[PDB]
Design a protein around this ligand. Structure first.
Ligand code: SB4
Ligand code: CA
Ligand code: CA
Ligand code: CA
Ligand code: CA
Ligand code: CA
Ligand code: CL
Ligand code: CL
Length: 344
């Protein structure tokens, strides 16, 4: 392919002539993103240029991690790859990596902001998040920082999870076990986040808008009640445990009185998601079977992922080894068919 250069976001992008009309649409994880027109298929795409992908072993391994992850993800509610390219003609000059996916014009904050969503619409949005999470969780991949700005949405409210498995971030949607650095956690950290997202879609208000980690924990405990001693097991820091134990005891609120006027099935699902005990939190696959999603649920169209080999995560390799491995993954990429779906 012939490449061309264009300055975007104050830096030179070098992309195949196939991709035209590049225009910036914001930052992504470890890179920045432009919308583009794919002249081969007439489809709109998003191209992410990774920022300094091989500057250090930290960048180099995270570049490999992201490319491996995105090459594996093949689900309608999860960001995957249409293309990956580099202007380099050999490994020796390989220093830049561009990732291509279908263009999604918005994030979930653009949906929930200037509209009173209907309950049927909220169901569809949360259903899609859970379908994507069932898939990634089935490959032992967790998001850990799921939030509206990590949900890409198009003009028809079709949604994809992004930046899973990977500047001041909001902590308002993080699972308490993550926010507070608890010793053990599981895939249901992401279900807590779904509960906070869903609550906000139903009420139009952030569920736990804490000003710091302590204020956020206090807001959480006001809703769900103070935890038992069993939960202290999870917390290494004695001062943190002593603090939580020292709090005046609070009962769990009845969610029916918090989410006044919501579909009772929505309230019931929130009660199952917003539990402090992560071993008692509903899973994505269980939530998909909940009656709240009855009109959308379809067991034939809620697939799991092929096994994903993450053995590389435990390995320390040299920068040039990560770089060569990443180059191999760029070269071996097989673009998917344009049409991968059939009528049910
Ligand atoms: N507009 C749009 N459409 C699809 C994806 C993205 C995207 C990507 C991304 C990831 C992988 C890839 F291969 C290509 C792009 N990373 C962050 N974002 C956006 C997520 C919403 N806020 C703006 C940036 N942006
Ligand atoms: Ca990891
Ligand atoms: Ca169906
Ligand atoms: Ca088809
Ligand atoms: Ca379609
Ligand atoms: Ca069927
Ligand atoms: Cl967000
Ligand atoms: Cl701790």
């Amino acid at each position: 392919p012939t490449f061309y250069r264009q300055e975007l976001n104050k830096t030179i992008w070098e992309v195949p002539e196939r991709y035209q009309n590049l225009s910036p649409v914001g930052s992504g994880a470890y890179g920045s993103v432009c919308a583009a027109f794919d002249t081969k298929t007439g489809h709109r795409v998003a191209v992410k240029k990774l920022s300094r992908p091989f500057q250090s072993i930290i960048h180099a391994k995270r570049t490999y991690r992201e490319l491996r992850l995105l090459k594996h993800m093949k689900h309608e509610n999860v960001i995957g790859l249409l293309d990956v390219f580099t202007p380099a003609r050999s490994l020796e000059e390989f220093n830049d990596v561009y990732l291509v996916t279908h263009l999604m014009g918005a994030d979930l904050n653009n949906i929930v902001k200037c509209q009173k969503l209907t309950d049927d619409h909220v169901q569809f949005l949360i259903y899609q998040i859970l379908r994507g999470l069932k898939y990634i969780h089935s490959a032992d991949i967790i998001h850990r920082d799921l939030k509206p700005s990590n949900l890409a949405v198009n003009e028809d409210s079709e949604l994809k999870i992004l930046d899973f498995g990977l500047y001041v971030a909001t902590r308002w949607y993080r699972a308490p076990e993550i926010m507070l650095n608890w010793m053990h956690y599981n895939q249901t950290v992401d279900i807590w986040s779904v509960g906070c997202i869903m609550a906000e879609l139903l009420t139009g208000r952030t569920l736990f808008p804490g000003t710091d980690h302590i204020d956020q924990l206090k807001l959480i405990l006001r809703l769900v009640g103070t935890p038992g001693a069993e939960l202290l097991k999870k917390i290494s820091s004695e001062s943190a445990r002593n603090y939580i134990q020292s709090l005046a005891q609070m009962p769990k609120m009845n969610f029916a009185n918090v989410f006044i006027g919501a579909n009772p099935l929505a309230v019931d699902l929130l009660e199952k998601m917003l539990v402090l005990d992560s071993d008692k939190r509903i899973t994505a696959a269980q939530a998909l079977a909940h009656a709240y999603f009855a009109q959308y649920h379809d067991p034939d169209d809620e697939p799991v992922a092929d096994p994903y080999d993450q053995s590389f995560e435990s390995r320390d390799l040299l920068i040039d080894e990560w770089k060569s491995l990443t180059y191999d993954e760029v070269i071996s990429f097989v673009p998917p068919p344009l049409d991968q779906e059939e009528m049910e």
